[PDB]
Amino acid sequence: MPHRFKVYNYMSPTFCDHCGSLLWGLVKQGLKCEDCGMNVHHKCREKVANLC
Ligand SMILES: CCCCCCC(=O)OC[C@H](COP(=O)(O)OCC[N+](C)(C)C)OC(=O)CCCCCC
Ligand SMILES: CCCCCCC(=O)OC[C@H](COP(=O)(O)OCC[N+](C)(C)C)OC(=O)CCCCCC
Ligand SMILES: CCCCCCC(=O)OC[C@H](COP(=O)(O)OCC[N+](C)(C)C)OC(=O)CCCCCC
Ligand SMILES: [Zn+2]
Ligand SMILES: [Zn+2]
């Protein structure tokens, strides 16, 4: 099933579940899936399989 990613403000350092690199920045550092909690870079979103 597709994910439902929504922009998220990460309060502690957090790494992208797709590529492994840090979700760097002060705010809105990436996207969190509302249904499974996966965290991704904005630009990793299209690389993620529809396996929510
Ligand atoms: C030496 C690190 C160089 C890269 C800088 C990345 C960074 O600063 O944020 C990654 C936070 C920072 O850890 P913190 O210093 O904020 O404390 C959390 C550590 N622990 C989870 C064990 C309680 O670390 C983690 O939570 C887990 C990943 C640690 C290895 C990543 C290189
Ligand atoms: C905090 C100390 C740890 C240093 C960071 C370690 C690290 O993970 O570096 C790698 C990620 C790369 O993330 P990027 O935001 O460049 O994009 C990765 C996703 N995609 C390639 C698909 C677009 O890039 C960064 O995070 C570095 C900061 C980039 C700009 C800061 C002025
Ligand atoms: C004096 C103003 C400094 C200029 C920096 C721009 C800024 O205000 O912060 C913006 C970024 C978002 O990243 P940026 O908009 O700087 O670049 C995009 C990075 N990526 C395409 C990989 C997502 O949002 C953040 O939270 C990071 C804080 C700044 C780090 C970037 C150098
Ligand atoms: Zn999901
Ligand atoms: Zn990523």
Side-chain angles (χ1 to χ4, degrees):
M1 285 309 266
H3 297 283
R4 297 196 301 118
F5 281 114
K6 177 173 73 73
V7 178
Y8 197 77
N9 283 325
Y10 293 90
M11 294 324 288
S12 43
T14 306
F15 295 82
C16 175
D17 293 329
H18 176 76
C19 74
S21 290
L22 177 73
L23 302 178
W24 62 276
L26 302 177
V27 292
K28 316 279 181 213
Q29 301 96 323
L31 312 174
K32 179 190 287 302
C33 176
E34 301 200 65
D35 299 319
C36 76
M38 196 186 278
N39 303 299
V40 300
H41 292 110
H42 287 76
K43 289 183 199 163
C44 285
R45 179 209 289 111
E46 285 92 17
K47 309 183 208 283
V48 179
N50 292 300
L51 276 300
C52 190

